[PDB]
Each structure stands twice: as structure tokens, then as C-alpha cells.
Amino acid sequence: SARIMTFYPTMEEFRNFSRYIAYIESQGAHRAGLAKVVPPKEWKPRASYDDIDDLVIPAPIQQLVTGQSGLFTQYNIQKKAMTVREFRKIANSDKYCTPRYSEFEELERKYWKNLTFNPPIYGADVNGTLYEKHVDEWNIGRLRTILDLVEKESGITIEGVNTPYLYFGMWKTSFAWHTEDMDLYSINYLHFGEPKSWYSVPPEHGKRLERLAKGFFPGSAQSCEAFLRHKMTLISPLMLKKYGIPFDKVTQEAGEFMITFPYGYHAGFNHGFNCAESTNFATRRWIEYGKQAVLCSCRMVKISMDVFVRKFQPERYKLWKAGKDNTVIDHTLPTPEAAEFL
Numbered sequence: 001s002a003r004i005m006t007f008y009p010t011m012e013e014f015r016n017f018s019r020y021i022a023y024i025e026s027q028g029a030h031r032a033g034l035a036k037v038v039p040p041k042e043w044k045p046r047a048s049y050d051d052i053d054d055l056v057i058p059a060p061i062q063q064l065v066t067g068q069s070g071l072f073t074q075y076n077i078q079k080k081a082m083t084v085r086e087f088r089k090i091a092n093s094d095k096y097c098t099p100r101y102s103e104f105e106e107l108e109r110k111y112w113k114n115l116t117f118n119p120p121i122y123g124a125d126v127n128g129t130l131y132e133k134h135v136d137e138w139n140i141g142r143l144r145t146i147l148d149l150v151e152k153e154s155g156i157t158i159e160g161v162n163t164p165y166l167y168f169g170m171w172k173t174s175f176a177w178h179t180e181d182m183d184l185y186s187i188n189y190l191h192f193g194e195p196k197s198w199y200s201v202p203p204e205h206g207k208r209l210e211r212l213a214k215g216f217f218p219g220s221a222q223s224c225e226a227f228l229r230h231k232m233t234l235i236s237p238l239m240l241k242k243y244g245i246p247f248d249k250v251t252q253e254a255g256e257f258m259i260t261f262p263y264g265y266h267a268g269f270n271h272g273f274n275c276a277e278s279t280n281f282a283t284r285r286w287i288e289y290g291k292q293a294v295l296c297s298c299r300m301v302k303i304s305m306d307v308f309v310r311k312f313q314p315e316r317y318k319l320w321k322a323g324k325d326n327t328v329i330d331h332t333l334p335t336p337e338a339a340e341f342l
């Protein structure tokens with residue numbers, strides 16, 4: 001019942017990325033807003049990670065968290081550029097390393113208890129890829145989805161959106177509740193290290209989480225229509241439970257992929273020193289989400305939907321451009337590409 005699903009594709013199933021997203025949607029994976037994909041054992045994107053210690057993290061961020069009673073605001077403080085070595089030194093030090101724990105529920109408890117203490121540093125938004133040049137399956141650098149149209153027609157690039165981002169984590173580093181820019185899909189691969197825990201709200205209950213955040217942060221909601229887009233709001237699983245917001249949790253381990261679906265609210269934290277690579281992608285189903293996404297009004301990323309409507313919805317272009325497209329999204333419907341599996 002809209003629970004996070006895990007998939008284990010064969011090497012043959014793994015070779016076609018877009019076809020596999022259509023397959024996981026025909027299985028109802030999009031309903032949770034988050035799905036896990038475990039690659040075939042024979043697949044590796046890079047032979048070793050012992051040769052990246054001198055890699056530059058240009059803008060590392062000290063994550064300052066303020067709040068109480070399961071409601072917090074994350075302030076990012078830019079620090080001087082450092083290497084993966086200097087970063088790992090701080091990450092694996094006694095001051096910033098992972099505390100001792102028996103089960104995930106205990107580490108999750110420590111996270112929500114200590115989130116405001118000892119601000120960690122996040123090696124976030126590093127422009128790059130750790131994939132070897134001749135890796136042809138699930139290459140984050142080149143997924144080959146319909147999102148490619150923006151770069152194809154204009155050549156414009158949006159860092160981390162249609163290019164890959166690297167994220168060097170440490171214990172207690174986190175990402176606030178949010179949906180992707182333009183309500184796009186996202187792919188996350190944990191290259192190595194300690195796990196990454198994720199929280200997810202099904203897209204069909206997403207307007208509920210927004211309403212709740214508006215009630216808890218009225219000043220923030222008055223200044224911006226979509227303040228959650230600022231990626232500063234942390235809401236504990238206990239608060240979500242209290243206010244009856246349906247959600248699920250999952251832990252991503254090194255060598256696994258996490259996929260977020262359009263309008264899928266997600267949050268989470270790093271268990272310790274690790275590295276993840278991510279980008280956004282799209283399917284034909286995303287078009288409607290992109291046309292209807294509520295963007296930051298104070299305040300940011302904005303993609304012109306005209307090329308997508310022109311190519312995939314030509315009949316509705318005149319109606320849509322005149323403000324007469326009164327289409328209602330059904331979050332339970334899979335992507336049209338999934339037709340072959342249904």
C-alpha cells in the first residue's frame with residue numbers, strides 16, 4: 001500500500017534504463033515516490049575509489065540546524081574548498097564519526113536527538129561523475145531520457161539537473177524535505193561508504209505535507225508559494241506520524257540506486273563517510289507535472305515546457321498556451337511507456 005519497492009534487474013533488464021523505469025511503474029513503484037534498484041553483481045561503474053583523494057570539493061557546507069519538537073530549519077554555511085582527503089579526515093575523525101549503534105532505529109533516534117549539535121560538513125553539489133568513460137548501463141552522465149531535449153534544442157545546461165552532481169557525506173549530513181526541480185524524476189547512486197537513509201511521502205499525499213509545513217512555518221509560506229523548494233525544512237518521522245502524514249523509510253547501501261518519482265517528497269541523512277552521484281531525468285508522464293509544478297516565487301531552476309508540449313502534446317499546445325489546459329494529474333497512473341508490461 002504505496003510502500004517503497006526494491007528491484008533486482010538481470011544484466012539484460014539492466015541494459016535499457018528508460019524501459020526499466022516503465023517496468024518498475026507497471027509494478028506500482030511510482031506510488032511510494034521512491035524505489036530502490038539493486039544492480040546485477042557483474043556491474044561496476046568504476047574499478048576503484050582509492051584514486052580520488054585529491055578531488056576538489058569547491059563549496060563544502062557546514063549544516064547549522066535550528067529548531068525543537070521535530071521541526072527544524074537548516075542553514076548552510078559555505079566553507080573554504082577542500083580535498084576528498086581533508087574531508088575524509090574530518091568525516092572519519094572522533095569529533096564527526098558515526099556513533100555506536102545496534103539497529104537502524106537507534107541510529108535514527110540519535111540523528112533526530114543530535115541534529116542541532118556539532119554541525120557536520122557536506123561535500124555537496126560537486127560537478128562531476130565517478131563513472132568510467134565506457135560504462136554504458138545506468139550512466140548518470142548520459143541516461144538518454146526525454147529530459148535531453150532541453151540541451152538538444154538549446155544547448156543550455158543546468159548543474160545537477162541535466163549534468164551529474166557528487167555528494168560527499170559524513171554522519172548527520174542531511175537533505176531537507178523536497179521534490180525535484182520542475183517535479184522531475186531523480187536517480188541517486190551510492191558509489192561507496194556508509195549508508196544513506198531516506199524518508200518518502202507518496203505523491204498522492206504530497207499536498208498534505210505542504211499544508212502541514214505551511215501551518216508550522218507561516219512566515220516562510222507567506223514569503224514564498226513553494227518554500228520547501230529552498231530545501232531548508234526538516235520534519236521528523238514522529239511529527240509526520242502525529243499529523244497523520246503517510247510516509248515510508250528505506251536505507252540505501254553502497255552500490256544501490258534510489259529513484260525518486262515526480263512530486264515525490266523525500267528527506268534523509270548520511271550514516272557516515274560516503275559518496276553519491278545524482279541527476280534528474282524524465283519520462284512522458286513527467287510532462288504534466290512540469291506544466292503544473294509550483295515554483296519558488298521569492299527568488300531558482302525553471303525549465304521551458306514549450307518544447308515538451310510542442311513535441312509530445314501538439315494537440316494541447318494552443319489550449320495550454322492560452323491558459324485553458326485544465327488537466328488533473330492522477331498520481332496512480334504509470335507512464336505511457338509502461339503499456340507493453342500492462
Ligand SMILES: Nc1nc(-c2nccc3c(=O)[nH]cnc23)cs1
Nearest residue numbers: 124167174175179180181188276
Ligand atoms: N533536487 C535536489 N535533490 C537533492 C537531494 N535529493 C536526494 C538526496 C540528496 C542527498 O543525499 N544529498 C543532497 N541532496 C539530495 C538536493 S537538490
Ligand SMILES: [Zn+2]
Nearest residue numbers: 178179180186
Ligand atoms: Zn532530491
Ligand SMILES: [Zn+2]
Nearest residue numbers: 224296297298
Ligand atoms: Zn522561494
